[PDB]
Amino acid sequence: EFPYLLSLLGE
Amino acid sequence: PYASLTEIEHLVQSVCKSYRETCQLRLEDLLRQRSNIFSREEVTGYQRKSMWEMWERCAHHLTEAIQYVVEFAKRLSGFMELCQNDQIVLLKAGAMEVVLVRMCRAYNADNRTVFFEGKYGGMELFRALGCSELISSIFDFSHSLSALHFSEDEIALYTALVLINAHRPGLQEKRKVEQLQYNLELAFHHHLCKTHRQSILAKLPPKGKLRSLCSQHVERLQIFQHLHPIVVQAAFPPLYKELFS
Numbered sequence: 001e002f003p004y005l006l007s008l009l010g011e
Numbered sequence: 012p013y014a015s016l017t018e019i020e021h022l023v024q025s026v027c028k029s030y031r032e033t034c035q036l037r038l039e040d041l042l043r044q045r046s047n048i049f050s051r052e053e054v055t056g057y058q059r060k061s062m063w064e065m066w067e068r069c070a071h072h073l074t075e076a077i078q079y080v081v082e083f084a085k086r087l088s089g090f091m092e093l094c095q096n097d098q099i100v101l102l103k104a105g106a107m108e109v110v111l112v113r114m115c116r117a118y119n120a121d122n123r124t125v126f127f128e129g130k131y132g133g134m135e136l137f138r139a140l141g142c143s144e145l146i147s148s149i150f151d152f153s154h155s156l157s158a159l160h161f162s163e164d165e166i167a168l169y170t171a172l173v174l175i176n177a178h179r180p181g182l183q184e185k186r187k188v189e190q191l192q193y194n195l196e197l198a199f200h201h202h203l204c205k206t207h208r209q210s211i212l213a214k215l216p217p218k219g220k221l222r223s224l225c226s227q228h229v230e231r232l233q234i235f236q237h238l239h240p241i242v243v244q245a246a247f248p249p250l251y252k253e254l255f256s
């Protein structure tokens with residue numbers, strides 16, 4: 001439930 | 012499986028480098044800008060801003076600070092080894108805590124001001140937010156940290172431990188986090204021993220201090236959000252909502 005957090009972790 | 016002295020020395024270097032690459036503002040820049048202080052006119056400008064606009068500005072700036080903490084986490088030795096769930100649990104719980112610690116760099120104890128939007132200003136700049144007690148708590152916490160005179164390397168090693176805290180509820184691989192935490196503790200203690208600064212240990216903030224400040228922040232956010240729910244929807248960063256909503 002954390003798409004922007006995962007996106008940052010993935011960048 | 013525990014770490015050699017060489018691995019611990021490497022870990023000190025690694026953590027300091029990660030901080031160096033993600034500290035957002037350079038300490039030398041912050042210090043040299045102490046004489047640049049918001050004029051009475053500019054302070055009046057801020058105080059006249061609406062509550063919602065001040066809240067949205069502060070949410071923006073906090074979110075930017077939080078992105079740098081995430082980058083710090085990503086470059087930290089052994090963070091990538093954590094499962095995805097635990098990465099989120101640690102950051103959701105700890106990111107704001109790290110920001111509150113990092114804030115002392117931008118705080119001038121001589122005149123009780125903080126670097127904000129390009130100049131130094133006192134707590135009165137923040138009147139429009141309508142949460143004087145929270146503001147006061149934040150300035151008090153920065154003042155307590157100013158007295159320790161952290162080095163940048165100390166800030167690096169201490170914020171690593173603020174993030175890698177095995178006692179967060181919800182962690183699924185507690186033991187792995189305990190091991191990473193222990194090694195980071197060894198690195199922090201090693202560095203302090205070499206620099207003759209072990210005396211700071213007794214002076215560090217009491218355990219649930221950071222937790223208290225973060226819980227107050229969330230409460231004030233919830234009160235705001237309750238009073239202005241469309242503003243939060245329309246104008247707060249998504250990351251901020253995910254972290255705090």
Ligand SMILES: O=S(=O)(c1ccccc1)N(CC(F)(F)F)c1ccc(C(O)(C(F)(F)F)C(F)(F)F)cc1
Nearest residue numbers: 069070072073076114125126127137145146149228
């Ligand atoms: O915690 S705050 O109340 C806050 C409110 C709303 C959104 C984010 C943060 N606020 C406290 C303060 F008293 F300082 F205002 C806050 C303001 C500014 C910051 C910032 O530290 C800084 F530097 F801008 F002042 C930053 F965000 F950047 F970190 C952090 C928290």
